[PDB]
Amino acid sequence: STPAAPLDVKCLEANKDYIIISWKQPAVDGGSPILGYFIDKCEVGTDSWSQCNDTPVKFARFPVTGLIEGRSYIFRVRAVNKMGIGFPSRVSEPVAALDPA
């Protein structure tokens, strides 16, 4: 009854101050509408996950902030419906918090 995991977590843009991520809605919503999404981050050296947003976001392209310039991060997304929070997506590829070019 909680939703399935979001799919295909990806990075659209990175710089040292924010990283934009997207994903795709889960194919299964648990029989209730997806109310939104939690995006978690984990520094590549670690196993410690932090929640990037306090309240779910409806949309599928989140700017992650609270980054340390030069550290690299992997991300996951959890979907929420009225029943609660589903299991996290597969983790993303690593992204460095560096300005491009």
Numbering used by the authors: 508 to 608
Question: Any passages from the paper?
Answer:
Obscurin, or its homolog obscurin-like-1, bridges the giant ruler titin and the myosin crosslinker myomesin at the M-band. Myomesin is a 185 kDa modular protein that localizes exclusively at the M-band, where anti-parallel dimers cross link myosin filaments. In addition to a mechanical role, myomesin is also needed for the integration of obscurin and its smaller obscurin-like-1 homolog at the M-band (Fukuzawa et al., 2008). Yeast two-hybrid and biochemical analyses have mapped the obscurin/obscurin-like-1:myomesin interaction to the linker region (L) located between the fourth and fifth Fn-III domains of myomesin (My4 and My5, respectively) and the third Ig domain of either obscurin or obscurin-like-1 (O3 and OL3, respectively) (inset) (Fukuzawa et al., 2008).
